[PDB]
Nucleic acid binder design. Sequence first.
DNA 1: ATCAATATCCACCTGCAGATTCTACCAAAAGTGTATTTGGAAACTGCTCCATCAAAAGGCATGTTCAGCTGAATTCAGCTGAACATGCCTTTTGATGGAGCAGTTTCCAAATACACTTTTGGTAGAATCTGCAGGTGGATATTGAT
DNA 2: ATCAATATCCACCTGCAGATTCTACCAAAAGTGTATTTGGAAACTGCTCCATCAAAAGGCATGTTCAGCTGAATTCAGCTGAACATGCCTTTTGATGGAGCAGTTTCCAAATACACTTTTGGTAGAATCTGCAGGTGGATATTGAT
Lengths: 96, 92, 99, 97, 84, 78, 104, 108
Amino acid sequence: KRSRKESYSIYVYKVLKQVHPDTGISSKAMGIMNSFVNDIFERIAGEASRLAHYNKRSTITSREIQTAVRLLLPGELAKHAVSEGTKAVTKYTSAK
Amino acid sequence: RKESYSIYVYKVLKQVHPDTGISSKAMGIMNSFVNDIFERIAGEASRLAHYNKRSTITSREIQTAVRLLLPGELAKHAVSEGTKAVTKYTSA
Amino acid sequence: KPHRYRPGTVALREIRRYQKSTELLVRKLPFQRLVREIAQDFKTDLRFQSAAIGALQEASEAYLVGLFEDTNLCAIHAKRVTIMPKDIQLAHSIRGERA
Amino acid sequence: PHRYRPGTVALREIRRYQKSTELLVRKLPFQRLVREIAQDFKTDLRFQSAAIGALQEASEAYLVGLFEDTNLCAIHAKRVTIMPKDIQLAHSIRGER
Amino acid sequence: RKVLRDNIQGITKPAIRRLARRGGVKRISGLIYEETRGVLKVFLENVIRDAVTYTEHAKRKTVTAMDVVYALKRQGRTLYGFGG
Amino acid sequence: NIQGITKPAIRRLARRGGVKRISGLIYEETRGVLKVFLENVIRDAVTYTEHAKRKTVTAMDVVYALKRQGRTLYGFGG
Amino acid sequence: KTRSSRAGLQFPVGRVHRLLRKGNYSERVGAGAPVYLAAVLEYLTAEILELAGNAARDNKKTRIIPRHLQLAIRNDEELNKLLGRVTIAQGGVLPNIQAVLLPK
Amino acid sequence: RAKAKTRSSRAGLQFPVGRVHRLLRKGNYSERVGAGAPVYLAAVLEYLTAEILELAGNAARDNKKTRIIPRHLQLAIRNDEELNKLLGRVTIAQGGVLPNIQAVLLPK
DNA sequence: ATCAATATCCACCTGCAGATTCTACCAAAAGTGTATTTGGAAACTGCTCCATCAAAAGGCATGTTCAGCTGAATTCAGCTGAACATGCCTTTTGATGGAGCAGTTTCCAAATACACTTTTGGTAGAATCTGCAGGTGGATATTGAT
DNA sequence: ATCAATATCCACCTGCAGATTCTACCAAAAGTGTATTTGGAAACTGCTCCATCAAAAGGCATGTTCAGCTGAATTCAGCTGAACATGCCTTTTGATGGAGCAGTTTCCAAATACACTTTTGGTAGAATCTGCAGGTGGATATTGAT
């Protein structure tokens, strides 16, 4: 009699308050945002899946995700996403 | 190293056209055709199983994928052929 | 007199109006009936979640709105301002929907 | 003193080139252009011949297709002469613009 | 229940006109409305066909918003806002 | 280098596309389109090269790049 | 005794199975799926080869080349829909000249 | 044992690294997933969320509202060259279109 | 270069639907301790790549000449937009039963996971053969012109 | 049109060669046979949502009139792009050596899967909060007649 469905709304809302601390988001707009995250997740992961396969490699590393990001995103968006991801990975491996 | 669908394309060629040959460039076209359709069918059946939270791609996923991917009257015949191969295979 | 806007003026008023808003432009109940009719002629005894009908209307209207932009470009390219079936067919053809 | 009327040889060339499948851009100039463009992304690269051939086949198929849509746009405007605004209209409707 | 017939005609002339307006169209020839109905009907057949195929494959009798969302993704018309 | 893509060669491509008469500005418009096409495809291909840690663009790198761009090519490995 | 001969197919069932498992499509793969999929790939292969053999014969040729695969695909409504985003290398295009462009 | 740190906090991120790791293992993308791949991907997803919400909030401000609705998302996407290309095949329900009237249509 | 008719703002107002925050258990993260890989980091092949070098020709660049196509200018029949009257049917609020999703359990037919035995399909030297491209010779197509 | 003449094009054969087809033999898959795991079909069933109904009301659909101005036809002349002969240069073609370098083979230390045992972070609702949709009125345009 109970059943539960995950979402990115919690983390969307946090990042929202970081950029516009005064601003809310209606559930319809949060709906869009959830579609966006799930979409890009699947495009990155799917391209990463293919990259690994083309190279007879059974593992998706941060290096795959990074090539996928460079193939999927244009111009400045790619440069900045590559920065954030590299930074996050080194911070994570520095145990930081 | 480097397997191909060539010998199987050639066998099917002799069945439908025992008089006819095939250039190596044409044989490459056919290889590209088979890998493409293979990935489209497999890719869709993969989605079908994930959507319905299954871990197994069965011929039911392949058939719906074919229905979803092939223009009707190629899906009809493909569904025929596939059903027929699965029964002939199970009966033995 | 009575007062009377010249042909073309209300049309531009309406482009500005509907380009400003986001509400659906086809009526809900008629569209729900179209969907149930097409669906039934494909499989019988089907039921629809209301959001499924809403998703189809959102997509169907986003598609037609997008097609009329392309159609409008084809009209203007012919040095007209009146969209005609030639334009929809030319747009549709180049879109690769059906070459 | 023999001379063909304008459009007559052109139609003749349409029939000739719609009949054949040979590449229509010369191979070396194209290889130069591929390597020049590629040099701006990664330096000191080498190309399989089959990679150059793939690119030239993709590239000529793309251009031939785009000339078909361009031709249709010129016909739509009551002309028989393709113009840049025809290429632009096709490129835009195709959702590459 | 009750026979469904000719419902394409409930896509009225004023509804097609408003949609042209959002699309930036100023003048509309009188033959546009029947061409639009035809184009809409092909669009809906193809999407409803794939959606219902997702339904049948799940052994359901109810077409869900997910079914329609997957149908549209198949067709390269990805939709945001019904992914629930 | 792109001027090496010549007027008569652009005529020939137009002819296979069914074109009877060509405005004199088509040739430069065509070279610009061809260059965007090659940049997009080659950029993707070299990204597959570099990922593979190679110095040689392979035909498969092009085929994968064309597939990403919705321009699937048959005859060179898929 | 192979699974292909058992399914009555020229196409390799065992290979289609190994490619499904190693292609990261699902965790598990039923036994009929490589049979079904292999039958579908063989059928569509036969359809193209038939039409392309015809295009060879109608050209006074006995060896199928890329041009004949192109004329088979493009002259068939359904193969054309299925392969409408595919480029067949060395296939060329169908002869076709818009009426408006013809003489007189 | 030690007190538990989330891998997000280790990564300096708002988005859930552990969940992204689980969605990778479950999504049938490869046999194995490295430790840095969910970190890098949760980072890219949060950066893109941040860039969209930045421009959406601005549109909300320009329209004198404090709650982002789909319109604001749509204006943010369509007006940014790069989001518009990233999402040029996507439909945002209830987003409408950009005000745009071809010049030749305006009163002569 | 003005009124008049009408549409468009824009700010100020108020509770209702719709957010944003507050609680409370579970699934799903994180910790920790072992058991397999992985795929890099070296080394040394053999391919296939690039770089010349030198011919010849096929092809492109160039300039002339004019044919005919594009575009500008003008007309006008009638299509389509604006405005109006009229009243239908969609929209909205609100029940109701019950179809059919979705959630728990329970558990065989069908799947993975080994460890061996045969088999086939990919290689690389051996064997014909299809059609390219080049002869002729004969109508066909085009274009000028009593 | 069915006059004379230029070029195009189309069939029919013809013989050397570049690709095909066919012969001959060794690893890596594919097939078996045992022995497990487990996924998800089958069987009550809780309980969301879907189809349907009623009923009242005003937003819109429908049809009509009327004429503004748009599309479509026609004409015309300048000038752009096609056809062409001319002549030279860049492309093509091709054994030659050399070398960069994919692709292999041998490890092993870092990194991943695994696996139960504990800890939260997030979800599903109750509870508390508040933008703004929608209703009204004057600035301030905007449009179109005179």
